[PDB]
């Protein structure tokens, strides 16, 4: 779903030769690791056993890590075009 289905290609309009900006990005990285809990805030985050979640009211949720490729392309007046591209590191 994340990779194939959620591709974004929209164009928005707001140096006076610039009329619109075409935002294009797509995710190619997604993994769901096991639930984690941060013990004393400054911890390395540790495994969250189900009973700990049940007793503390925490949600047995594993973090989702994402990484995307982004293409910011600006279309100017009279057809001049510039492309800004970035490789975005895996975040969560």
């Amino acid at each position: 779903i994340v990779k194939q289905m959620f591709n974004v290609d929209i164009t928005y309009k707001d140096d006076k030769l610039r009329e619109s900006v075409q935002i294009q990005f797509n995710f190619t990285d997604v993994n769901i690791e096991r639930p984690q809990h941060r013990n004393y805030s400054q911890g390395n985050k540790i495994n969250l056993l189900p009973n700990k979640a049940r007793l503390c009211g925490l949600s047995y949720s594993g973090p989702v890590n994402l990484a995307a490729e982004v293409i910011l392309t600006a279309h100017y007046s009279n057809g001049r075009q510039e492309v800004k591209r970035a490789s975005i590191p895996p975040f969560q």
């Binding site: 290609d9 929209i10 164009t11 928005y12 309009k13 009329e19 619109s20 279309h75 007046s77 057809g79 075009q81």
Partner: protein, 191 residues
């Protein structure tokens, strides 16, 4: 009766319309390509293999719209309010002359439909070539009409306008060029 493709008709039609032959030769294949590649004939998809190829029905629709507008031009006497293009053509002809338009202009459908059906069932690429060839044949036949003199001008302008409309629609299906996306009256533009 045996049939055979002839590139002369497309060469002549391209010369008359002043656009390059590869533009008409690829009718139905305008999708997703810049008009520059259309005219240069770059990346022309191979001839159809299956009778389910959308190009066959695209060219058939083109020939159909040509014949439809031509028969509208022939039968102006029937219309209580004819389509705007035949009106623009024949606003300066009397009712008797409008009936003479039907009596004078030759039918051009021949047996296109049965032939195209058999060809598509049998050979899709041959059906595509036959539809292109028939459209060009009809256009040049109309443009080659010489008698009577008064209808020659009307027939010529009609044929030019109609083939230009067909090619214009085909180009309108093609990929848009660099253009201002603000013309659509809203903030956002999605693909």
């Amino acid at each position: 009766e045996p049939w055979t493709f002839d590139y002369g008709k497309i060469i002549k039609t391209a010369k008359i319309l002043d656009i390059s032959p590869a533009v008409i030769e690829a009718i139905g294949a305008m999708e997703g390509r810049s008009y520059a590649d259309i005219r240069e004939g770059q990346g022309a998809p191979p001839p159809p293999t299956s009778m389910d190829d959308p190009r066959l029905m695209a060219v058939d629709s083109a020939v159909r719209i040509f014949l439809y507008n031509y028969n509208c031009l022939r039968h102006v006497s029937t219309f209580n309010k004819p389509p705007i293009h035949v009106e623009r053509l024949v606003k300066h002809l009397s009712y008797e002359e409008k009936e003479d338009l039907e009596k004078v202009l030759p039918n051009v459908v021949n047996e296109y439909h049965t032939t195209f059906k058999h060809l598509r069932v049998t050979d899709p690429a041959s059906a595509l070539l036959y539809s292109i060839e028939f459209l060009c044949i009809s256009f040049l036949t109309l443009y080659e009409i010489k008698e009577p003199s008064w209808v020659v001008n009307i027939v010529r302008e009609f044929a030019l306008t109609e083939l230009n409309t067909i090619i214009q629609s085909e180009k309108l299906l093609s990929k848009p060029g660099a253009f201002n996306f603000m013309i659509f009256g809203e903030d956002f533009v999605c693909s």
